[PDB]
Write a protein that binds this ligand. Structure first.
Ligand SMILES: CNC(=O)c1cccc(Cn2ccc3cc(-c4conc4C)ccc3c2=O)c1
Length: 379
């Protein structure tokens, strides 16, 4: 009875309602309705279930203002909740696409992190809900935009890069202390709030660690420009690695902010993969770079193999690095100091810091396509 009230429980009221609602969806087809048992359930429950569908949070309760992000299986929408008039970013994930592409389980960690991290470094989730087509995650809007947009609009000086690198480190350290490795650290995932401070956002590739702090994985995951050698090398077989893969992707981020291009750019994915493999040779700063010895040192200390990578022993050895010497902020208070770019926002749906941007087949027998999504609804 404690778990029925526990928002972390798999058998709370919201998951029970998901169970009943998924069942009705997956049975209500005339073919399956020839079974009398199936029809005896559906006629008894159809009316109340459609009443429940209207009363629970649904997509029509939101006004879609503009699309501000896209991803493999859906989009992010800037929405206004009609009743409350509050403003949110709503992420949609396609159930058809996720089933078709056998990718229907990455979203639990994403949901739980944003729902429960309760951290200034993690975008908070207020509501998760679903309909027969989509999963929805209603998050706090990040009007600052992402670091892609920022780098597109400024020549980033080393004083700014110091700041964003420090905040990314504290954000990644925060996610580490929850037992997770991010595995897909990129400027597209680094968003800025009303005040210009960083939060992490796309936790689709995240994974919980061992008691050893390790993870077993055989799939290379993340983004090609930012993937570390150990994760890339794990596509073969029996990859065993720890959180220090996120520090590799901080180094790629530092290079990109200061140099203007990713360190292992290539005109093919296949080329990028090969450069990362050959990183001890392909990593090469342009001659006209004009980047400090301290910045080059930190970048190079991140863009190494895990055995000699800065951060392997913890974050303290990152924090004391001389590149982070500065007269603006400390590691203790950085988020309470002034950001390099404070966003000038004209409305609560000002979206000026974001660039502009098939159904299930009717079953013949019970397939259960709605079953992988039971328990996703939250609050
Ligand atoms: C398997 N993963 C996918 O298919 C997938 C589907 C949709 C989007 C993404 C990646 N992406 C992109 C932009 C984005 C913006 C915000 C945001 C927070 O606050 N304000 C804003 C704006 C929050 C999350 C995301 C985000 O996740 C991935």
């Amino acid at each position: 009875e404690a778990l029925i009230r526990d928002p972390r429980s798999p058998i709370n009221v919201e998951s029970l309602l998901d169970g009943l609602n998924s069942l009705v969806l997956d049975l209500d087809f005339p073919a399956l309705r020839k079974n009398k048992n199936i029809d005896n359930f559906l006629n008894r429950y159809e009316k109340i279930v459609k009443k429940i569908r209207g009363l629970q949070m649904k997509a029509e309760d939101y006004d879609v203002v503009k699309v501000i992000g896209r991803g493999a299986f859906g989009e992010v929408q800037l929405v206004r909740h009609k009743a409350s008039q509050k403003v949110y970013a709503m992420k949609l994930l396609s159930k058809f696409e996720m089933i078709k592409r056998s990718d229907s389980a990455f979203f639990w960690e994403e949901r739980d992190i944003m729902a429960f991290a309760n951290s200034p470094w993690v975008v908070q989730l207020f509501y998760a809900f679903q309909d027969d087509r989509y999963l929805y995650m209603v998050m706090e809007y990040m009007p600052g935009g992402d670091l892609v947009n920022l780098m597109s609009n400024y020549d980033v000086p080393e004083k700014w890069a110091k700041f964003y690198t420090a905040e990314v480190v504290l954000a990644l350290d925060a996610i580490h202390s929850m037992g997770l490795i991010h595995r897909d650290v990129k400027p597209d995932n680094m968003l800025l709030d009303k005040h210009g401070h960083l939060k992490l956002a796309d936790f689709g590739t995240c994974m919980k660690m061992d008691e050893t702090g390790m993870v077993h994985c055989d799939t290379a995951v993340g983004t090609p420009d930012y993937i570390s050698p150990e994760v890339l090398k794990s596509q073969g077989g029996d990859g065993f690695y720890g959180r220090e893969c996120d520090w590799w992707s901080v180094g790629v981020f530092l290079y990109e902010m200061l140099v203007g291009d990713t360190p292992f750019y290539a005109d093919s994915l296949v080329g990028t993969y090969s450069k990362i493999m050959d990183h001890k040779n392909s990593l090469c700063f342009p001659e006209d770079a004009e980047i400090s010895k301290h910045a080059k040192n930190l970048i190079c200390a991140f863009l190494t193999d895990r055995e000699v990578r800065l951060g392997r022993n913890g974050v303290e050895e990152i924090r004391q690095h001389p590149f982070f010497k500065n007269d603006q902020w400390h590691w203790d208070n950085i988020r309470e100091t002034a950001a390099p770019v404070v966003p000038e926002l004209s409305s609560d749906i000002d979206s000026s810091n974001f660039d502009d941007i098939e159904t299930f087949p009717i079953p013949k027998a019970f397939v259960g396509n709605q079953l992988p999504f039971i328990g996703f609804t939250y609050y």
